[PDB]
Amino acid sequence: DYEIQRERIELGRCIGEGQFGDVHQGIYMSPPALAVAIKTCKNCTSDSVREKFLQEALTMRQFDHPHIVKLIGVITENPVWIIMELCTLGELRSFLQVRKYSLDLASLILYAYQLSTALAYLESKRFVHRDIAARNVLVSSNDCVKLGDFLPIKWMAPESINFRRFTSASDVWMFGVCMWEILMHGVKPFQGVKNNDVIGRIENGERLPMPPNCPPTLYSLMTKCWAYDPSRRPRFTELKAQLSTILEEEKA
Ligand SMILES: Fc1ccccc1Nc1ncnc2[nH]ncc12
């Protein structure tokens, strides 16, 4: 059980806006004062909003992995708060844009690898994420990223677009797009394309182009993620191993 007394929490500065409300950084004093992220919920006075907001916490207590944001606890009395581990450097997408001439290829491949370990862990728990995108990834330090979110047509597998089918294979399709976003320094996929035109493009065998400076072996791995037939896509355990070798060939 994750119920925390509010007096053990000290609110700090706002670090961004979440789905249900402002996200703040703060301190959690337990019997060694830890820096935390505090998710708030402005409309949580109503049980329908509260149940949806707290479902994120219910989902997060199931996981314990170094590349998945940790649930510290919850404050169920109004105003309702979710206490999470703080990832100081913020959202990946913005971090990539800002540090576009700072981060080398080896660092970019490292983030993809780290995300593949988090996704292999989830796949081992038979958990389907449904929203793998660079915007749902958090940066803890310059060499440590975390998966942090528990209609994106341009990230979705064709079967998800056409039939609302979400499986472990559709999650592999989205990871391919996430890797592309990483190597493109946080540029959104299919820029200047309308959401309704994406399915038609994919159906014609069209894919996101090879990013400049992307190793061709890494791009062939992304194209394997983008097999139209879901049964032809690799699983995260294979991706993780591949990304390990690609990373070593880059570090040397
Ligand atoms: F909601 C946000 C919007 C922008 C950037 C970050 C966040 N959110 C966060 N920042 C740092 N650590 C975190 N743990 N859980 C969430 C979160």
The preferred substitution site among 87, 94, 98 for testing ligand 1, maximizing ligand atoms within 8 Å of CB, is: 87
Nearest CA to ligand 1 atom 2: 16
Q: Which helix (H) or strand (E) holds 215?
A: none
- What the chain holds in terms of domains, given with CATH numbers, is 1-86 (3.30.200.20), 87-252 (1.10.510.10)
Task: Please pick, among 47, 131, 171, 197, the residue that the annotation labels catalytic.
Answer: 131
Q: How was this structure determined?
A: X-ray
Could you tell me the resolution of this structure in angstroms? 2.4
Query: Cα–Cα distance between 146 and 132 in angstroms, integer?
Result: 12
Residue 152, both tokens:
């994106």
- Residue 144's beta-bridge partner residues? 141
b/e sequence 48-61, b meaning 16+ C-beta within 10 Å: ebbeebbebbeebe
Query: Cα–Cα distance between 205 and 188 in angstroms, integer?
Result: 20
What is the 222 CA–ligand 1 centroid distance (Å)?
27
CB 146 within 8 A of CB 68: yes
The preferred substitution site among 23, 74, 97, 144 for testing ligand 1, maximizing ligand atoms within 8 Å of CB, is: 23
∠ CA 158-161-165 to the nearest 5 degrees?
85
Annotated active-site residue 64? The verdict is no
Query: Cα–Cα distance between 162 and 119 in angstroms, integer?
Result: 24
